[PDB]
Amino acid sequence: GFKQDIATLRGDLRTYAQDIFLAFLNKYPDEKRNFKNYVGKSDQELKSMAKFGDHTEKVFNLMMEVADRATDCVPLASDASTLVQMKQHSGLTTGNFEKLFVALVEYMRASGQSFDSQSWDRFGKNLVSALSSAGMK
């Protein structure tokens, strides 16, 4: 289930983080408006750009902590507030998050593993509602 999936992802986290983030950028190419340094690059080129790997791993280190602290796929209010208040996230609205989690769930369903894809769909929806409550537009 959801708790096991956190363990699965954490067991190969840099690889999953990069592959899921690439699936997001390739499903929604207009979302690169938020990531201008990644324009004009193939997947293999991005996987040899130092900030793409280092930043995307740090994103997923925190995402897995937020998931682990959740109850029945509902995150802590303190975690939602951190995500809204972060200076890096100043330009963002909740649609940006909705699209990230749509891409993550699609990746899981296509992997041919045993991910609990439906719980990740709930977690993304419940994180969006918590972000709205914490003041994201």
Next chain:
Amino acid sequence: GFKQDIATLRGDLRTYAQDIFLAFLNKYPDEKRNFKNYVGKSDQELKSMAKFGDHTEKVFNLMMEVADRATDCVPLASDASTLVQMKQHSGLTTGNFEKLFVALVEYMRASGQSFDSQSWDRFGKNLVSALSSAGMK
């Protein structure tokens, strides 16, 4: 305290994992006997390989699972048994683990980051005694 330290380490796990493993190898150069593939390389030579990082981070992920499942810094017997039974750990003894945790606590005390060094010292001692109870020499 101990629970916050797990969150600090996971937030930047690949960087902490590399720096603590290098502190261990530099404190106890004879322990590099267990790691023939790292002979004849400086710190920055080892880190220049994205694989050294991949591999070391997977080690520290398991360490953090065992730490988070502990009660009052006493690991589960079943987690000690996993570490004894791993094929890659055949022909280790408890002294190898003792040295690792001495280096880890020394790194935490020298760092600018607040860590509960006394809890990690207890965890390492209690892990050694659990390894012995699960059949390590």
